[PDB]
């Protein structure tokens, strides 16, 4: 019965231990440190009603989109501080947002167990629902756009799924995870993606196969975010406890642990830099830290908000990083 599963898990752990040859810090001890990094708010973006959870930089690096409980998802032009579109939300709650690579559609998901996709670019400048996605038992944790037609969603029913908007049905469903999934990230190659959940386990799924190829369970508490290394062969997660970890997909185990004695709060969002050197992680202690990926040290402190930060995003151009907090003050930091 369960004895075979326990033996297989022990064998997997032994294989992961045997795969370990040298620690990442031992290899990176020779490299020069990044040094002190000072960042300041080049542009502050205000005018939003309530606390926000979500943000997704556009591929053009110009348009930025955020969502709050106010019942409105509003697109912000980063350069000129102009609210290009203000889309009211049918459901008062949104726990995620997404921006299409083409930029034609904008996705929003909330606690109403239904994800909605808005047609941002229309004739006569009217924003309307294109399709509303079918029920996933529970709040839609996170939503991303593989293309203009397909959206991969996560929700509280412990299941992730990729949907075709034209049909409006579940093309494939990823099941088999114990806890509620809370975050996900898609690889730059878009063939693979991982999902961060509340069951203290982060596992990679294959889009075409529909089966979890690998499973990582290094963390002890529930994890709240996950982002890919720009190379696409590694990804890092932020957890409820102060620790954040970086996992190597080929090494199948946890490479480096990011933690400090002083920090005891939770981590809300994790985003990599364009080069991947700086792992930008938000915190529940009302600030965020720009931590070095390799040396595993604090490159610099970064505090601008009264409330806890709730979302981060590094633009594809890499020019600067934006952060969103519960004070409704979404500030873009370079």
């Amino acid at each position: 019965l369960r004895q075979e599963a326990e033996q297989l898990k022990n064998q997997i752990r032994d294989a992961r231990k045997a795969c370990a040859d040298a620690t990442l810090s031992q290899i990176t001890n020779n490299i020069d440190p990044v040094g002190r990094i000072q960042m300041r708010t080049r542009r502050t973006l205000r005018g939003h009603l309530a606390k926000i959870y979500a943000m997704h930089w556009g591929t053009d690096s110009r348009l930025l989109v955020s969502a709050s409980q106010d019942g409105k998802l509003i697109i912000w032009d980063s350069y000129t501080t102009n609210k290009v579109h203000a889309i009211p939300l049918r459901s008062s709650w949104v726990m995620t947002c997404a921006y299409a690579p083409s930029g034609n559609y904008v996705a929003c998901g909330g606690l109403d167990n239904i994800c909605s996709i808005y047609n941002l670019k229309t004739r006569e400048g009217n924003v309307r629902v294109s399709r509303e996605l079918a029920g996933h038992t529970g709040y839609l944790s996170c939503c991303r756009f593989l293309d203009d037609n397909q959206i991969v969603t996560s929700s509280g029913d412990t299941t992730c799924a990729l949907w075709d908007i034209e049909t409006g049905q579940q093309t494939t469903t990823f099941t088999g995870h114990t806890g509620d999934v809370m975050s996900l990230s898609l690889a730059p190659d878009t063939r693979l993606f991982v999902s961060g959940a509340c069951d203290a386990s982060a596992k990679l799924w294959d889009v075409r196969e529909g089966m979890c190829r690998q499973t990582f369970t290094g963390h002890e508490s529930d994890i709240n975010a996950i982002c890919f290394f720009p190379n696409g062969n590694a990804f890092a997660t932020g957890s409820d406890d102060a620790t954040c970890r970086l996992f190597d997909l080929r090494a199948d185990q946890e490479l480096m642990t990011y933690s400090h004695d002083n920090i005891i709060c939770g981590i809300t969002s994790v985003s990599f830099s364009k080069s991947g050197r700086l792992l930008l992680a938000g915190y529940d202690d009302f600030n965020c830290n720009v931590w070095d990926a390799l040396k595993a040290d604090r490159a610099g402190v970064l505090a601008g908000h009264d409330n806890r930060v709730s979302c981060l995003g590094v633009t594809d151009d890499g020019m600067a990083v934006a952060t969103g907090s519960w004070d409704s003050f979404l500030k873009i930091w370079n």
């Binding site: 205000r46 009264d306 004070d327 003050f329």
Partner: protein, 281 residues
């Protein structure tokens, strides 16, 4: 030698008032979180206190120490006008803060809709404009100046100038500055304390297992002990000119001035203001 100590004390008081007002204004302006509808009144109060402490307190100290007003008569006119304007603005700002607290406490649901940033700016502009109309307008037009022969010479003389006013202007100016606001805030804080006592009684009854009195007592007693003696002697000297002496008038005027210095301590004890203060320094 007694003059040197008094001058040092006056300089220290002016510096303390200026520093407190500047710190309050900087804390209000720098942090976006501290900026709230009820804190625009605090910003106006801080601006008025800073203006008063920077303008009239050093000039008054110079006048009392030197015993001769070296500047021109028009400059002394402007000094008296700006002094009375700042005093009225400060007291009326305390009254407006009391009214805001009354609306916040007595009718909790009406407060959110009634008080707005535009509404706060409108009421602050209205109170500053009414202070101007009540204080600055009669000073320049020369209505207030004493009709009796006494001090007409010193009003004509440029060397020295002392406040000698007609009995008509003194009553109305003192009324609008202090007495109407005194009644308003007394009634407001009586109602607020009654609501606090009712809430304490209800929470004691429900749980089954005062602090507001001390705070209200501070907020009332500081203002009363600072200002009421000066305005009562303002009322009484025009009635009986032989009743008081000039030194008493000056001492009570400066003890009234000191309220602006004390006030940042009284009205900026909120945790957000403490956080802003420790962040700035």
């Amino acid at each position: 030698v007694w003059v040197v100590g008094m001058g040092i004390v006056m300089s220290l008081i002016v510096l303390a008032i200026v520093f407190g007002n500047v710190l309050v204004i900087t804390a209000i302006a720098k942090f976006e979180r501290l900026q709230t509808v009820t804190n625009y009144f605090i910003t106006s109060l801080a601006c008025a206190d800073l203006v008063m402490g920077l303008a009239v307190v050093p000039f008054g100290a110079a006048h009392i120490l030197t015993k001769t007003w070296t500047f021109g008569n028009f400059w002394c006119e402007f000094w008296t006008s700006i002094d009375v304007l700042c005093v009225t603005a400060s007291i009326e700002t305390l009254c407006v803060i009391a009214v805001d607290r009354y609306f916040a406490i007595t009718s909790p649901f009406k407060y959110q809709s009634l008080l707005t940033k535009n509404k706060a700016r409108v009421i602050i502009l209205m109170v500053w404009i009414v202070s101007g109309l009540t204080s600055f307008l009669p000073i320049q037009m020369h209505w207030y100046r004493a009709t009796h022969q006494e001090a007409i010479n010193c009003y004509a003389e440029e060397t020295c100038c002392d406040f000698f006013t007609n009995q008509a202007y003194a009553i109305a100016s003192s009324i609008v500055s202090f007495y109407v606001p005194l009644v308003i805030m007394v009634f407001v804080y009586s109602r607020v304390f009654q609501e606090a006592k009712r809430q304490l009684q209800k929470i004691d009854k429900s749980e089954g297992r005062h602090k507001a009195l001390k705070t209200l007592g501070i907020i009332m007693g500081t203002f009363t002990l600072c200002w009421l003696p000066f305005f009562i002697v303002n009322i009484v000297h025009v009635i009986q000119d032989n009743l008081i002496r000039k030194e008493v008038y000056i001492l009570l005027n400066w003890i009234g001035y000191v309220n602006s210095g004390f006030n940042p301590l009284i009205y900026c004890r909120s945790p957000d203001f403490r956080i802003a203060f420790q962040e700035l320094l």
